[PDB]
Design a binder for this molecule. Structure first.
Ligand SMILES: [Mg+2]
Ligand SMILES: [Mg+2]
Ligand SMILES: [Mg+2]
Lengths: 319, 327
């Protein structure tokens, strides 16, 4: 009994385009009745909307119950925080609402309220109108946490607005505390520490890990203490435990494994994540990693060209 | 030549587009008394002419384009040094750079237009790409010679990605990545303002180009394991104060037609809102200073090593109290 956990970016897709072999890889598992999940540090859309897109592109039925995205574990926080600043692309508002967050504010809602809060926002008037909403108690009800769902697309605004929140007086908009501290005014969560990721471009691009480093750098500058943030996403144990539960529930719904193989392109997320958790791993060369790159101390079970190689070589050798 | 003033703009004369109460009156007071002044700002984006036209209209005084130093004004000295520059800032900085004489100006939005996948987290709308960017001859086949940050750009995920690409490239060629790690960037990079904070219309101080610089530097360190060797101008740098001193000298000569740092004046008073730029800059250069409370500085904030000559409420108090004591 083996199962697979596939990364998406640099393994199944580059952007919206499938990698050759990705469709065949999943079709092969389905023929053989081998369970799989998708475990991605990407996000932005609902689990349903994302799996609908992947299903269409790869010509397989991927269930919303087979996927863990960066933000999926934020379901665990819905009873902890009444009002959240949900940072990400505009779609993350709906995702957070769907999880059951009581009071969701998107960062663009603050830009709508007062453009002078974010002097270097690139939002056009049309983008403000489309992306944001009027929040009538934006200034009178405190924020309880900042949750970064995915990489937002207006960083001078996004970073300013996050900084305002984590240096505020107890989460109240338009306030600035006097006290310097490593503990932010309200808690802040990052869902992906990937410095780099693989999109259609030939060179690795910065991801949410890079965004996090930037937020942290300015927090340190203002406070003289490092930020006490929360982190999820691969390689964190929290995300692997979450994925493990999704996989167990999926395996039951198909109806515990001798081995789980993480298939990834990034040593620093996928491979270390699996290795720390006790999962096996197959490092592909179609994304962040190029053969010759420093593996440091991760030790992938197999190193292979692409996802179809990962599945076929793993099955031949281990199933 | 008893005295001249050098005024900061943001948090001293203006908050955003709105004059601070007394700002117009302060300049009119100097002009009635034939006391010369310059404007020395770490802001920028538009030409010295366009900027002084706007300020003139809003303060109802005649400010000459020869009376202003903006963050990027000293980039005039670099025009024969670097053929192709990545001119980073708001779209208006393309025209400012071209106006200065740079041979081959590329704006960061030109690279986003060339390939959107370079900047996956760009916020540019299609309409903004059409408005801001240009097709650039030989974008992919001619090296970039430097990155010059003119002012704060307004799409930082793209801006930071694109700057990082340049300073880690194979000798400035787009679409490349060098093999080696070093403190020395692939091509030189200049920042024109190290202001962590600045004062706009909002009541809380907002991050400025100094913050942007710290972000670029952080990701450079992450990729290279060595701190970035950059060039920095703007207040409080000696380069910028020297440049401003020469603009003042030239302006006084024009009008007319001591210490080394104030020549030909007995005293030069910097009027600023930011201890970390205006005050320490003036102090290190040899100028006197007035610190106002209408911008970044709040009463009781720690002044660290800065010792302003006077601390006052606003720009009109700065002028009136300085003239009383020092004129
Ligand atoms: Mg990946
Ligand atoms: Mg935009
Ligand atoms: Mg100022």
């Amino acid at each position: 009994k083996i199962a697979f956990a596939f990364d998406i970016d640099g393994v199944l897709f580059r952007g919206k385009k499938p990698i050759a072999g990705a469709s065949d890889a999943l079709k092969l598992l389905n023929r053989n009745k081998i369970p799989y999940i998708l475990l991605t540090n990407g996000g932005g859309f609902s689990e349903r909307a994302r799996t609908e897109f992947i299903s269409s592109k790869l010509d397989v039925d991927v269930s919303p119950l087979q996927i863990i995205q960066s933000h999926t574990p934020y379901k665990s926080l819905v009873n902890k925080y009444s009002r959240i600043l949900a940072v990400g692309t505009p779609s993350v508002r709906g995702v957070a609402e769907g999880y059951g967050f009581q009071d969701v504010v998107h960062q663009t809602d603050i830009v709508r309220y007062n453009r002078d809060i974010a002097p270097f926002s690139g939002l056009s008037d049309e983008q403000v109108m489309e992306y944001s909403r009027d929040i009538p108690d934006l200034t009178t009800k405190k924020f309880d946490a900042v949750l970064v769902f995915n990489d937002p697309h207006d960083w001078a605004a996004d970073i300013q607005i996050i900084s305002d929140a984590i240096n505020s007086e107890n989460g109240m908009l338009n306030t600035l505390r006097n006290e310097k501290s490593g503990k932010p005014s309200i808690p802040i969560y990052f869902s992906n520490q990937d410095l780099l990721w693989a999109n259609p471009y030939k060179l690795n691009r910065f991801g949410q890990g890079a965004f996090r480093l930037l937020v942290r750098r300015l927090y340190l500058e203002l406070n003289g203490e490092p930020l006490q943030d929360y982190t999820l996403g691969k390689p964190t144990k929290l995300t692997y435990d979450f994925a493990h539960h999704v996989l167990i529930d999926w395996e039951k719904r198909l109806s515990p494994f001798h081995a789980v193989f993480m298939v990834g392109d990034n040593p620093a997320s996928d491979i270390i994540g699996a290795q720390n958790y006790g999962w096996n791993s197959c490092l592909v060369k179609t994304g962040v990693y190029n053969e010759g790159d420093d593996l440091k101390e991760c030790k992938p079970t197999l190193i292979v060209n692409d996802v179809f190689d990962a599945v076929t070589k793993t099955l031949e050798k281990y199933a």
